[PDB]
Amino acid sequence: QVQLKQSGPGLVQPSQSLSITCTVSGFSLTNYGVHWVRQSPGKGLEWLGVIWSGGNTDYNTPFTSRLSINKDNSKSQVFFKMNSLQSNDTAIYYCARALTYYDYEFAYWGQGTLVTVSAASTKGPSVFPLAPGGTAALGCLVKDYFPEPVTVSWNSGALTSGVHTFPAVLQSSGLYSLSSVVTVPSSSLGTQTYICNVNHKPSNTKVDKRVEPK
Amino acid sequence: DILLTQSPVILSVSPGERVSFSCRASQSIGTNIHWYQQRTNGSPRLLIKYASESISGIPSRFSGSGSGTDFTLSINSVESEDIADYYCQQNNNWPTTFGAGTKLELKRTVAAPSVFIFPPSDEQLKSGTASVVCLLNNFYPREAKVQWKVDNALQSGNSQESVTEQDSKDSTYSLSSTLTLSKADYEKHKVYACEVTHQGLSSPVTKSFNRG
Amino acid sequence: XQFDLSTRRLKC
Ligand SMILES: *[C@@H]1O[C@H](CO)[C@@H](O)[C@H](O)[C@H]1NC(C)=O
């Protein structure tokens, strides 16, 4: 299949530069253009620029001075770099490929890189258990991390039905907090193990928290 | 640049209903418009290119029409998995620009929340902070009240709520309310209660525990 | 609506 896989989410200090790598498969960079698009609260979806099959680049007008796109065809890699970020450059960045080599209808997207522009320090979360008509609820409290995001899954991806992972909320401390719950048959608490797999890529903190009835 | 005006901002319909999204351009752009779907935590998914041309793998219930300045994305029989935001994009004029999007919401029957309360873990208490969590699961519609009480005293200002987007399958919401106390305050009191008020309950529901 | 980075959804 055609895929685009971007590098991981992260913090960038104000006035520093942002770097993202797009690694592609299921097509050759010599045959297609790779576009960059971002998505911000203040401006929604903006098209940023593109590198073509032949290496030419076009940058959207507000970004000509601070934007640079490069690639390594052999490694199937596209390199995005933007200079002097300010806080309203906090956004989700995406690479994308059009349906046809010269066009702009984006049928394939990368998973997006969430970029936070802040002078703050990275901090991994602590994970705490939320301990459990025959339906029990249980979960994980994922507390005090910066920046967004954390991924949470259950039993390494095998448990998904009934799972709710809430939107993160910013505490007064300036750190985020989030809970993830799941409902299960109470009779299964005796025989099944439940683990939430927490992953905070910006701090490289990976925790598996087993959640048992207290 | 071409300004693209999508309307309305929020669309609310019931399943099985036809629904239409509008996208107006600031000057004629021919039929050079593309439409996208974005689901909770997703990247945009291409639904329609050039006003009306179909996309491989996209359900046949999606179609588009229009030419010039006024365009329309249609869903003939809305499903629950269609809960999402919808965006138009023009490419008649460089640079390509996107609209601000339309949010699609689905009505359904009233569903009372299931309420669960979780005391702080002893692990967290070692850290000098206590989080008490109250869960309202699978309810509709979104309006709900969570009221915290500690030893009959009303808590105010020390709680935060988070609400899921609409479930793609049953169209319900879920909500968490977290009460945050210092370990000292938590150790000083006994009865921790969260009272939940919602349209699907004939009276408010309280879940509570006694510390220890 | 306005785009929310946490959920990638519009929020009013
Ligand atoms: C950020 O600020 C600059 C200068 O005020 C402005 O031109 C730009 O539109 C802003 N960016 C966003 C995404 O809001």
Cβ separation A167–C3 shorter than 8 A: no
Residue B49, burial from CB neighbour count under 10 angstroms (0-12, 13-18, 19+) = buried
- Protein residue with least CA distance to atom 7, ligand 1: A62
Query: Contact at 8 Å (CB) between A36 and A96?
Result: yes
The Cα-based distances of A180 to A7, A157, A168, A187, B41 in angstroms read 25, 14, 10, 21, 15
Query: Contact at 8 Å (CB) between A173 and A192?
Result: no
**Do B1-108 and B109-212 fold alike per CATH?**
yes
Closest CA in chain C for residue A91: C5
What is the number of other CB atoms lying within 10 angstroms of the CB of residue B155? 18
- Protein residue with least CA distance to atom 1, ligand 1: A88
> Domains of chain A by range and CATH?
1-118 (2.60.40.10), 122-213 (2.60.40.10)
Q: Pick from A31, A38, A77: which is nearest to A52 by CA?
A: A31
Domain ranges of chain B: 1-108, 109-212
Cβ separation A167–C8 shorter than 8 A: no
DSSP code for A64: T
Query: Contact at 8 Å (CB) between B106 and B171?
Result: yes
Q: Pick from B67, B61, B56: which is nearest to B90 by CA?
A: B67
- Pull the structure tokens for residue B24: 């107006």
Closest CA in chain A for residue C12: A41
DSSP E strand stretches across chain A: 3-6, 10-12, 18-25, 34-40, 44-51, 57-59, 67-72, 77-82, 91-98, 106-109, 113-117, 126-130, 135-145, 151-154, 163-165, 169-170, 176-185, 195-200, 205-210
Cβ separation B91–A106 shorter than 8 A: no
CA torsion sign, A68 to A73 to A74 to A76? positive
- Protein residue with least CA distance to atom 14, ligand 1: A42
Q: Which CATH superfamily is domain B109-212 in?
A: Immunoglobulins (2.60.40.10)
Find residue C9's DSSP bridge partners. Answer: C4
Using a CB–CB cutoff of 8 Å, tell me whether C9 touches chain A.
no
What is the number of other CB atoms lying within 10 angstroms of the CB of residue A174? 11
- Pull the structure tokens for residue B188: 């000083």
What's domain B1-108's architecture?
Answer: Sandwich (2.60)
**C-alpha A69 to ligand 1 mean position (Å):** 21
Method: X-ray
Closest CA in chain C for residue B6: C1
